[PDB]
Amino acid sequence: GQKVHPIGMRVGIIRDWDAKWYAEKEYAEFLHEDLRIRKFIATKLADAAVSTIEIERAANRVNISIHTAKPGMVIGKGGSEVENLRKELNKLTGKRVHINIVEIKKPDLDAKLVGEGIARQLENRVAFRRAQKQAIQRAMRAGAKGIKTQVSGRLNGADIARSEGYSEGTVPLHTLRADIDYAWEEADTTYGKLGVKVWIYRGE
Amino acid sequence: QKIRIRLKAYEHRILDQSADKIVETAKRTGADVSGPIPLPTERSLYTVIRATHKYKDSREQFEMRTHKRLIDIVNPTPKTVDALMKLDLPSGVNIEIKL
Amino acid sequence: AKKSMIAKNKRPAKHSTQAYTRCERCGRPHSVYRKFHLCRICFRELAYKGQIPGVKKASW
Amino acid sequence: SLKKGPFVDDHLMKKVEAQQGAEKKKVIKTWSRRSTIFPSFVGFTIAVYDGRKHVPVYIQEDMVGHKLGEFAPTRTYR
Amino acid sequence: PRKGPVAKRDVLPDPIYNSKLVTRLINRVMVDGKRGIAANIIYNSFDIIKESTGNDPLEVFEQAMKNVMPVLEVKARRVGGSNYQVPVEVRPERRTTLGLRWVVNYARLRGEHTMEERLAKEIMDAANNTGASVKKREDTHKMADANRAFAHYR
Amino acid sequence: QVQYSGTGRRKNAVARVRLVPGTGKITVNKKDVEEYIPHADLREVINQPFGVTETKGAYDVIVNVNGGGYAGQSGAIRHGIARALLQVDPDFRSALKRAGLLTRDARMVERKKPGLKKARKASQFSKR
RNA sequence: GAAGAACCUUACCAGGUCUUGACAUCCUUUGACCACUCUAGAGAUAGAGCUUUCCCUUCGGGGACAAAGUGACAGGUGGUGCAUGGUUGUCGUCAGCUCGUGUCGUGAGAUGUUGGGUUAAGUCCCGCAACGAGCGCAACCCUUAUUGUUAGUUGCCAUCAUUUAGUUGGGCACUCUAGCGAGACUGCCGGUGACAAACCGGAGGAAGGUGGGGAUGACGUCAAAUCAUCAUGCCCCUUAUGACCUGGGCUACACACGUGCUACAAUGGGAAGUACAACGAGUCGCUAGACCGCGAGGUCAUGCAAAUCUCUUAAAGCUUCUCUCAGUUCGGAUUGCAGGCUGCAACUCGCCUGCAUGAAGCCGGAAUCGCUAGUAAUCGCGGAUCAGCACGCCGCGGUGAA
Numbered sequence A: 001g002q003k004v005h006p007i008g009m010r011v012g013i014i015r016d017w018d019a020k021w022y023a024e025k026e027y028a029e030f031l032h033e034d035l036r037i038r039k040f041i042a043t044k045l046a047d048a049a050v051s052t053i054e055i056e057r058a059a060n061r062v063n064i065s066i067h068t069a070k071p072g073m074v075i076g077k078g079g080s081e082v083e084n085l086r087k088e089l090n091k092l093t094g095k096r097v098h099i100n101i102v103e104i105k106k107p108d109l110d111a112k113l114v115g116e117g118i119a120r121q122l123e124n125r126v127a128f129r130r131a132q133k134q135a136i137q138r139a140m141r142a143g144a145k146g147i148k149t150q151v152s153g154r155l156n157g158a159d160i161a162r163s164e165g166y167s168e169g170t171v172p173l174h175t176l177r178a179d180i181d182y183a184w185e186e187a188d189t190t191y192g193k194l195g196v197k198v199w200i201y202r203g204e
Numbered sequence B: 001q002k003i004r005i006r007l008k009a010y011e012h013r014i015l016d017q018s019a020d021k022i023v024e025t026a027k028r029t030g031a032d033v034s035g036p037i038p039l040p041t042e043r044s045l046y047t048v049i050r051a052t053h054k055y056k057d058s059r060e061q062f063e064m065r066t067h068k069r070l071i072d073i074v075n076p077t078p079k080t081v082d083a084l085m086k087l088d089l090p091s092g093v094n095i096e097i098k099l
Numbered sequence C: 001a002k003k004s005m006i007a008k009n010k011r012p013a014k015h016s017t018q019a020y021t022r023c024e025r026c027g028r029p030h031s032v033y034r035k036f037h038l039c040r041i042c043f044r045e046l047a048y049k050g051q052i053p054g055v056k057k058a059s060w
Numbered sequence D: 001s002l003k004k005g006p007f008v009d010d011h012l013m014k015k016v017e018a019q020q021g022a023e024k025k026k027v028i029k030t031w032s033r034r035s036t037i038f039p040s041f042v043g044f045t046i047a048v049y050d051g052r053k054h055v056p057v058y059i060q061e062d063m064v065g066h067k068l069g070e071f072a073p074t075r076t077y078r
Numbered sequence E: 001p002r003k004g005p006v007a008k009r010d011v012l013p014d015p016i017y018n019s020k021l022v023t024r025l026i027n028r029v030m031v032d033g034k035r036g037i038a039a040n041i042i043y044n045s046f047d048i049i050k051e052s053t054g055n056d057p058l059e060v061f062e063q064a065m066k067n068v069m070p071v072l073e074v075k076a077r078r079v080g081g082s083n084y085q086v087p088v089e090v091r092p093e094r095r096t097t098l099g100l101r102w103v104v105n106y107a108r109l110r111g112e113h114t115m116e117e118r119l120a121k122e123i124m125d126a127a128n129n130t131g132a133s134v135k136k137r138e139d140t141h142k143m144a145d146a147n148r149a150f151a152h153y154r
Numbered sequence F: 001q002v003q004y005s006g007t008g009r010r011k012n013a014v015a016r017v018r019l020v021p022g023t024g025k026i027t028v029n030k031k032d033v034e035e036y037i038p039h040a041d042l043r044e045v046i047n048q049p050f051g052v053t054e055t056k057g058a059y060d061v062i063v064n065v066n067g068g069g070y071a072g073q074s075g076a077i078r079h080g081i082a083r084a085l086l087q088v089d090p091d092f093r094s095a096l097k098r099a100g101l102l103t104r105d106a107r108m109v110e111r112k113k114p115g116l117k118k119a120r121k122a123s124q125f126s127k128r
Numbered sequence G: 001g002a003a004g005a006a007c008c009u010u011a012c013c014a015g016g017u018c019u020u021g022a023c024a025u026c027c028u029u030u031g032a033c034c035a036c037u038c039u040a041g042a043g044a045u046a047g048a049g050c051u052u053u054c055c056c057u058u059c060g061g062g063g064a065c066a067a068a069g070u071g072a073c074a075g076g077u078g079g080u081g082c083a084u085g086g087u088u089g090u091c092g093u094c095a096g097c098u099c100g101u102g103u104c105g106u107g108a109g110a111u112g113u114u115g116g117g118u119u120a121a122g123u124c125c126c127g128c129a130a131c132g133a134g135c136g137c138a139a140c141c142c143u144u145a146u147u148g149u150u151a152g153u154u155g156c157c158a159u160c161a162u163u164u165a166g167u168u169g170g171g172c173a174c175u176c177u178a179g180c181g182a183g184a185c186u187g188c189c190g191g192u193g194a195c196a197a198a199c200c201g202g203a204g205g206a207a208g209g210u211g212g213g214g215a216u217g218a219c220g221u222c223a224a225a226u227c228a229u230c231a232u233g234c235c236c237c238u239u240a241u242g243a244c245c246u247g248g249g250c251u252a253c254a255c256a257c258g259u260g261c262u263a264c265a266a267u268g269g270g271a272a273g274u275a276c277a278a279c280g281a282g283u284c285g286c287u288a289g290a291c292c293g294c295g296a297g298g299u300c301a302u303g304c305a306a307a308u309c310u311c312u313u314a315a316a317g318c319u320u321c322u323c324u325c326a327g328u329u330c331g332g333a334u335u336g337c338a339g340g341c342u343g344c345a346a347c348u349c350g351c352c353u354g355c356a357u358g359a360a361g362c363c364g365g366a367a368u369c370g371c372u373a374g375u376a377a378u379c380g381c382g383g384a385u386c387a388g389c390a391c392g393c394c395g396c397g398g399u400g401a402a
């Protein structure tokens, strides 16, 4: 293998961490509470289709935020769902949690959402080729600069594994002022587990 | 005099703007303020063998830095004292009021 | 066997010279940074995900 | 290297003093891997565990210094 | 190396006699990043030389040198793909290089238990054409032109 | 009164030279120049600035120093002298440059790299 | 892999032991488990003792919780890198690999990507049935070398005084700390060149021609490696390959090989004086200081959650004296005895100290490796894992060649 996780390079330089705090001498509880909370909202993603998670740090409380393409579905009917969040969270935390929400815009040009969708389609035994192609269809036409898409594994629920994908636009990688995103998902019907990885580029 | 404040964070912009804010809250009411004194910026180091079973050649080392600031003030009136007690923001950098 | 073992450490040990270190999410017995309580690879990866405050890549 | 006195485990001492009155029973099974030898042991007969089998061995006089583990070697080379 | 020749890093003169040769000889005694010791044996050897038959630590030195620095050399070249060794017109600088090299090395085996008696006696014997370094140069010149017949029109 | 200064840097060592009219002398850390220095007759090295301008006396030298070995900082005083003499007459800097000894030698210890025993040493390696 | 095998950790062997089981969820009764002591035990456990006790009440109830039961079951470092995801090694930091539209060929295919000039390079220029583009090269990034400015403590001491001292007065000049700026771009000179690209020399400048170093690894090859970090299809175990405990392994020794350290001494052995770095670690931890024992250390006490205090005056270096060419006063493997430290416990199987004994070994064949500069060679410092244990590994600095 040879390549480098691309949001593992622009981190710190032009894009910043997504857990903004500072903890000297208290640096395992904070980490393994952040991990706990980050894991336990995977229930929402089943339908809410969230993208990001921040972990701010109060004086003695927990302020976070999220983004998802459906604000009504997450907060619920009369905001009661967010209350179930609060009460499950503080019980999970032992610390007063103060959540917040912002709506994501142009949810086509994300990366985790797109991988979520194409893995979804691959679950329903659909042709990977047209899946990738219509993904990049709706993506590029939303206004972008380049997309690549890779798929690997026991393709078409078939014999010895392979990998191949298609790309339009143009995506420079070794350059740094790139702001390129990246997302990697998984699925399978009955043949082990497949692999899809997606890269976008939306400005330097 | 009898009050000072340390800073320890990672990105210098937040530290510097916190510095500007506290200097406002100090030289506003009274005077005799001290500037944003730089500091040696402690650094860490680690080394992770960039593989999973073998090949102890491919290393991948990471790091950590901690910029610092330091500001004392003289003749703190009851005004700016309580303004310090109430100023809390920003919330990315840890400060500590100290005599 | 990793489940019986992981269950072992969560108890108070039989004697003081027995409480070792082992990753939390994964369960590696060796080489766990006892500043973070992560194994070698899990910290490696999670650094990429922008979820450890601090850690970056070091060029000099 | 234990200048605060030597050491032998209690679940052997009480089981070796319990014969000081009468004659000694030929058997004292044990773990036999943490105990040095005290003067109160001469003339007994202690079997010694080697992780596989217990090894019956008596007690002489000069055989009083070292620990119990130096008589049932767990190597078995030949 | 492959593209073209390269620069040569000249040295400074000495802080006693002010000689580029003296420094260039002090350097060729040093072993393992330890210099001062070399300077000390150099100076002590020089004083010993000037003691018996006092003329100069420099003049008798150059005498021994011109006794040593060769004029030809067998340069193995396979123009005919074979073991042809052709006598070569040795360059100026490499002459001094080899002078110092043979001097120091072959003096190292002189065998005075004393620290620097080995060197002093060696250069004093070389200036008078007695010693294998002189024999070394004469042997080089006796193997050169030992085969200049079939190895010269090249 | 009249006093002249100038700094010098070599191999991560730094000396703070001070110049003043005297007889030709230098007091390194309140010590004679032959104390801080070992045996080292790399003193022609140190007076080498003088051997080209103000030849070869006579001012005095106050000097602080810290860092590096002896040879490093010894060479590192050579440059405070150059900068001080430069302060006197900007009519000298040409004859200094032509004789050099004015720019900071940036050679220094090498950043090593993981996997190699030294900065460039490669371990011995079995062929077959 | 292993960035810490005495127990463990720990999969493996001998013993002593359990079954919805050590770990998760449901359900029935429920309802709050603890913890504590004494016994028998190698413990696992067994057996008794005050006991696990309602945290909401609307009069009806709910969570943590056992314990029992109940079946839903869990469980596996068992199997297949040749069913797989992910993550690496190499060709290679080598300069290449491609496409859209036009055009050629009956077709596999070809043109672009070729020739001349140039270059670290598919880098640029020129001409050409090709016109244009993408991943690559480069540049955008980090650090090192000069410095303007903004700021002066726990940093600095020049102009003053005093004290053991930059300490304490006084100051922020310098040094340094660290933000924002500035600066190297063939920018100007000469020449060579088809006037192009580029190349040789020059000034100025701190650095001149990618200034030095790092991060950065294209299409793909090798069914390379990995179900033992994790995940996972299929196959399999299920009163046992699942599970608890003690003891031993993984440290076994006629032997063959790879990597390292100490050496075979006079540039040395010993004894005595004498100065100079840099990177980082520190609250149950770094020990100041003083006292004791020759030592490893112990005792009482001192600051330090930090530019303050400590690890920590670095070692080779420099100055004298002694030893005379010998298995030597070199070498100190090996071994007897007496100690030290952590540790519930150092025989198996720790590190270190004192005394005593004193092995092979006087530069190593055929063969073969590394290295172009602050490099090679040589000498110390720190820290990762970590009660404790480093000739390993990851960084730093000193001296300094051909």
Ligand SMILES: [Zn+2]
Pocket: C023, C024, C025, C026, C027, C028, C038, C039, C040, C041, C042, C043
């Ligand atoms: Zn882990």
